[PDB]
Amino acid sequence: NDHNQRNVFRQAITLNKKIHFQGDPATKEIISFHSPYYFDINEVINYINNRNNERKNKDNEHIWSDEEGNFKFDNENAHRLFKENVTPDGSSAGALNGKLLNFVDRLQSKIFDK
Amino acid sequence: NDHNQRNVFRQAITLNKKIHFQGDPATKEIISFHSPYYFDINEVINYINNRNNERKNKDNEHIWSDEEGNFKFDNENAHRLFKENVTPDGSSAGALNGKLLNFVDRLQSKIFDK
DNA sequence: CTTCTGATAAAGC
Incomplete structure (x- = not known):
């Protein structure tokens, strides 16, 4: 199902x-x-937790913002989602907004298994 | 599938x-x-019952309130959910919100089995 | 208009 x-x-x-x-x-x-x-x-958990918090703009593309400035979420800019300190700017929720909260919790509660 | x-x-x-x-x-x-x-x-049931009622804010992080004060559900503060007195507060329903009701009810049947 | 809630559905198994 996933x-x-x-x-x-x-x-x-x-x-x-x-x-x-x-x-x-x-x-x-x-x-x-x-x-x-x-x-x-x-960074993989940080990337999925970021795409958990996606916000698109009326033109249907996800617009982010980091300490260097606002950037479109695209192929050459997808590496910037590996950092925790990114804030999205958007008019509406993204495609995977709130859809990976269960997925990140299962991911984090498996890495810290001793 | 569980x-x-x-x-x-x-x-x-x-x-x-x-x-x-x-x-x-x-x-x-x-x-x-x-x-x-x-x-x-x-106490495990209390945490699972609490996470069954979790509420998240716009930042997709679960925010909680107890006697000590308001706190965000994370590894430092997740131990505070073992009490049943802590109440949720949030804009929207959480990840596990409404999805553990049968899971708790099945668990309490095993504990209260004589 | 967007958000959230709720309901319907489909799943795989």
Whole structure:
């Protein structure tokens, strides 16, 4: 039954592997969800908890804001959601607004399993 | 299909095991769900009943109010839900709000079974 | 107009 919980999990991990990748950009594009490269799990939880708090604008795109300024949520700007200190500016709730609150709690209460 | 119910059950027991622990803090942090430590079964129901009535604000964080004062549901303050006197306050219904009613009712049947 | 609530539905199993 999990669809919206599924792709946001795989998109967060796949994008975070390209952020922390320190090699040539030719093999950065071939990085996938199954590739064995380092990603921060705490930024992955922060990204999903951010997309939990999405707010789109009348033009139907999600507009965020961080300490450098307001930015559209797009492919080259999706790495900025890995930080906790982002506040959304929007007229209406986003596509996944309040839909991953159950998903983040299950994610956090599994990482801190000893 | 009970991942939300299984998560809050493991989360309530593991946290209640930590709170009732009276030993050294080094042992406290490695306390897990299987660890044979004392936990109040009635306090676990109170936390699950409270999280059944949780209310969140616009920032998608569950805000609570008790005798000590207003607080936000997080790992530092989630122990305050083991009391039944704490009341929710929020703009909208929480993640587990209304979704644990049968889960509590099934649990109290096992406890009150003679 | 947006938000929230509630109801209907579909799920997989």
